[PDB]
């Protein structure tokens, strides 16, 4: 049974703003890659379906769990123990005046980590799976660069290990290099613990090696959906076939 | 064992006018156990269009490709995503010209993933892993580093190599053997012989004549 | 003569933490793309170069003028009317409290323009030039997605007609087809109107298709430069072929 | 007028335990106007190599490639990369089997680019690009739409067509008939002949016999 459900969810700022009569089903160890124009309501529909946006119509399903109609307590422990969010902005996923270490560290004790060596050594694990030099680990993110920043939000948001994770543009400010180990390290999360990724994306080659089942999104709705390779290589929506054909071929 | 009904597609290409591309008209295939069927026909008869289709990588407009998974029959044109990605990861397997992996992973783990995905051990999956790179002689050197970093005749060595990995009751071949020279095309030969011989449902395109004459066990004609 | 020329320059925050000896020249009407590992100090080099980071050591010379040799005045006259920056994050480049036309209006105001209709025209057909559409000029920023948030960004810095603009990952949150219709914005800019850009980016794509030569720079400093073509099909240093090898192939 | 002189080239890959491949050693090759030169040698001689290195695509570790531009000489080996550019502009034209484009802008806009960045008239490029096109027989309703949504023959006349819409007094041709039909490879032949008589020196690799016989001028054996 789905890990996540959503049905017939709308969340709309103004009429074409935002997403309306989207559903689809999340399963564990598998990836949902959502691409789209920039303007399209990815963000919104991911803010929605990660609790951090009520909607105006639909419902949302967790082990079959209503996700809003929980009290705002369970939502936030969900928030805070299993599910992982990783913003488009690394800073809006980071504490500023607080260091890489204790980033990475919140999550870990907010899951009854009460061990400080432990913390710290996970926390330096994780900067080195990321590839961040273990030396940083006591430097503020401010100090960070866009990407050093980005791989420790990712660091911060995978660190409990969590069943679910909700991603936007993970890739962007990273160097393809750190961007295929983020690629290895996500796929392995995936299948040997079983995670669940929905990642919002616009590098369709980073969707094509991770994301398992895709949705191309437009003018807040789901125009397209199915297989990630025959949405790719057999597109049916005019959209798709625009959006595959602007790929910069390398 | 596969069973084409009637699938047609055409592809409509909204991109220039929306014109109509149409490549595959009620065409229709059964294939056994322990049987190699090669499409034959001339080029654009729809030969890459229906194999890939088999693979669900296309999606005919209208008929059934009902393939046996498990126990059951699955119909790929209408099945979700899930059951035609459960039926890629354990039934129908898929060599072609390209090694499409993640850049920074070494060869002996593009061979051994397919493998390791399905629970099999570690040590199972570096060995069989090890035995198809010797058999395709891929070099010991090449075998701990990215295929990226290869040549394009050695990636696809291990392109075949990671195909192979999986005993899958079901194969397509997109022309494995093309650029590959005599020796190393023999081998790529014996493999899918050997597949055969255990009871795999092959599926192929081929360009060389020796190649269909040693492999091919029926010919299909996608010239209509 | 070149537009821009950059000799020994060198800001180190800590050992290792920025950008060490670095020099190379810049022409009009070409596109110096840099490209490198998230934390070789890419950012911390267009800032300098940019004339919002005093250099340690090395000179900056604009139009055979040194750059920081000036006026704190002459360097913001340069800032706000001949020079574009575009920066990583796009409202760190952007007023929030302001509408998306006065962002525009603002720089077109500071080149000398006095008649509202005119300025208003302009933002306009800027943003139907990114794409946006020309309902939303007198939304502010806030209430644009990140993609929207950035071609605004570039549209603010590219009204004024710049002859140098220094961008740092300007593809960054765009969808392929936005981000073809800058690339194709850009170049015809650089060749009609003999722009200068200076282009950090990790979508190796974008520097091939763009970018006229290449700089490469690992732990604060250029490993390998020369023409983009060059380095990316014949690389010579270790990690320029490990970087190129890291492509996501489509 | 080309001129190579000792140029030698191997690869030393990093990746891979820093492994050294020679692919050229003390090369040499002299055309003049007018005259088309063809690199023949066993795969592997380093014909593409040779032949990039003269588009400056690739840099020989030593030996000189000296190209007359405008009225001078030009080491490409040791020039500038603004002269490199420059005299790829104007001087040294290059087709190959494969559109780096930008993808959505139209094809006629493809081709006419090299040509509008010279400063030629908007009219005079749209009617070259127009001519070039219907001479390789691309669809006129193709004209206006970006080569990406084409197939891969259509954007092979297109980028045929890009690469000979500037009259370069250098010219490189990386098979570029390779895959075309008769009609097209001998619109391509006659394309080709045309840029001899009028003072083009061509450097090509051609794997057809008869495009070959009917092009090649002069071989040079890349073998050694
Ligand atoms: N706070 C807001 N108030 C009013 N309108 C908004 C607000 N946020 C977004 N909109 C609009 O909602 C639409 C979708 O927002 P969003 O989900 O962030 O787009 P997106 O698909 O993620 N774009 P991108 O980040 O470039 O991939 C856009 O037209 C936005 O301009
Ligand atoms: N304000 C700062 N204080 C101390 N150290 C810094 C500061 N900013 C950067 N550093 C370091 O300076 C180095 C280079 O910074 P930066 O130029 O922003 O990297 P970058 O190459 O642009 N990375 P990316 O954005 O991912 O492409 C990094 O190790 C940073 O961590
Ligand atoms: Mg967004
Ligand atoms: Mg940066």
């Known amino acids: ?250 | 064992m596969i069973n084409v009904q009637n699938v047609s597609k055409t592809f409509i290409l909204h991109q220039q006018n929306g014109v109509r591309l149409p490549v595959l008209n009620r065409a229709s295939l059964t294939v056994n156990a322990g049987e190699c069927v090669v499409l034959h026909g001339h080029s654009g008869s729809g030969k890459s269009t229906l194999l890939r289709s088999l693979y669900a990588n296309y999606l005919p407009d209208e008929g059934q490709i009902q393939i046996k998974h498990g126990d059951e029959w699955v119909d790929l044109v209408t099945a979700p995503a899930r059951k035609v990605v459960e039926i890629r990861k354990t039934t129908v397997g898929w060599v072609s010209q390209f090694l499409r992996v993640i850049p920074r992973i070494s060869a002996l783990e593009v061979v051994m993933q397919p493998l390791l995905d399905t629970g099999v051990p570690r040590e199972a999956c570096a060995a069989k892993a090890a035995r198809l790179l010797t058999r395709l002689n891929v070099p010991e050197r090449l075998w701990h580093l990215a295929p990226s970093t290869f040549s394009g005749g050695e990636q696809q060595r291990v392109n075949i190599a990671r195909g192979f990995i999986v005993d899958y009751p079901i194969l397509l071949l997109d022309e494995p053997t093309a650029s590959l020279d005599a020796k190393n095309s023999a081998a790529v030969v014996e493999l899918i012989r050997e597949a055969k011989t255990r009871g795999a449902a092959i599926v192929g395109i081929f360009h060389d004549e020796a190649v269909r004459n040693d492999v091919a066990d029926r010919l299909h004609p996608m010239g209509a």
């Open chain 1, 1 to 250: 049974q789905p890990l996540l459900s959503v049905n017939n969810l709308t969340h709309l700022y103004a009429p074409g703003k935002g997403f309306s009569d989207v559903s689809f089903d999340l399963w564990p160890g598998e990836v949902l890659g959502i691409v789209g124009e920039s303007g399209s309501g990815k963000t919104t529909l991911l803010k929605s379906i990660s609790a951090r946006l009520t909607p105006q119509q639909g419902e949302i399903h967790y082990e079959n769990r209503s996700l809003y109609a929980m009290s705002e307590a369970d939502r936030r422990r969900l928030l805070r123990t299993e599910w992982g969010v990783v913003h488009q902005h690394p800073l809006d996923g980071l504490r500023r005046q607080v260091s890489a270490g204790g980033n990475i560290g919140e999550r870990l004790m907010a899951t009854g980590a009460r061990h400080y060596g432990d913390i710290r050594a996970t926390a330096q694990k994780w900067l080195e799976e990321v590839e961040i030099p273990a030396n940083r680990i006591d430097d503020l993110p401010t100090t960070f660069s866009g990407g050093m920043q980005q791989r420790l939000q990712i660091a911060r948001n995978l660190v409990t290990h969590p069943k679910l994770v909700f991603m936007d543009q993970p890739t962007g400010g990273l160097d393809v290099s750190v961007q295929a180990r983020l690629l290895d390290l996500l796929r392995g999360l995936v299948v040997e613990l079983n995670l669940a990724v929905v990642i919002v994306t616009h590098d369709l080659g980073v969707a094509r090696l991770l994301a398992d089942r895709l949705l191309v999104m437009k003018q807040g709705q789901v125009v397209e959906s199915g297989l990630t390779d025959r949405v790719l290589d057999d597109p049916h929506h005019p959209y798709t076939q625009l959006l595959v054909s602007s790929v910069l071929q390398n």
